[PDB]
């Protein structure tokens, strides 16, 4: 599961807080570590380097390290993740969610934004949203292109430490209305 160091620095937010928008942050934040666990687990079974919000520049450079870093039209997109393999650059995503909805965006906005650079650099850019069901724990990977290269995904984890953590934060602030309609 999640670091124990983590665990309990979870713990300790929901014991101390009093307030309906630090309590908002915890559950944010829940849903971040969430994101973040899946991205090392995955970023494990999958054998790259885990990664996170990384500069598309960065790729850029990583990949193709003669090209200007002054003068070159990327875009400003920060994916999870990517793999660059026989001149295939795979921009990968973590995604914890029940439905498909977050990841259609995530897609549609980074395959859009990526056509220019791809054709630029002659180099196929595929977009690949990773998505975990925290529920049913099934994975779903968009990219057929992807799954051909690597063997079957398994990514054998669960969220019950996060689900533990956000039902003491409903136990503490359940019936405070300013927290069950907060956005932040
Ligand atoms: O990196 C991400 C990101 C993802 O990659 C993602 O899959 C889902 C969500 N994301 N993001 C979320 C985020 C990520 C993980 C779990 C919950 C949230 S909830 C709103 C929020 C994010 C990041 C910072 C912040 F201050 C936020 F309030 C932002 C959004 O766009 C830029 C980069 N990014
Ligand atoms: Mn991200
Ligand atoms: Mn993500
Ligand atoms: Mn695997």
């Known amino acids: ?9 979870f713990l300790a937010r929901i014991n101390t807080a009093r307030d309906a928008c630090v309590a908002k942050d ?15 687990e995955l970023c494990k079974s999958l054998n790259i380097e885990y990664r996170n919000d990384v500069p598309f520049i960065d ?6 390290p003669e090209v200007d870093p ?17 001149n295939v ?16 965006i995530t897609y549609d906005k980074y395959y859009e934004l990526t056509r220019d650079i791809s ?21 779903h990977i968009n990219s057929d292109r992807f799954k051909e290269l690597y063997p079957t995904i398994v990514v054998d984890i669960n969220f019950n430490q996060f689900f533990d953590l956000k039902q003491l934060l409903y136990e503490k602030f359940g019936d405070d209305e300013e927290f069950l309609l907060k956005v932040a």
Request: no cysteine.
């Open 59 to 64: 790729i850029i450079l990583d990949i193709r």
């Open 70 to 86: 002054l003068t070159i039209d990327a875009p400003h997109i920060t994916p999870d993740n990517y793999l660059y393999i026989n």
């Open 119 to 139: 054709d630029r650099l002659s180099i196929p850019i595929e977009i690949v949203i990773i998505r975990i069901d925290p529920v049913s724990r099934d994975l």
């Open 1 to 9: 599961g999640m670091d124990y160091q983590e665990y309990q620095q």
């Open 89 to 104: 650059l795979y921009i990968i995503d973590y995604k914890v969610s029940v439905s498909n909805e977050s990841s259609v």
């Open 26 to 40: 915890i559950d944010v934040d829940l849903l971040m570590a969430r994101h973040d666990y899946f991205g090392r």
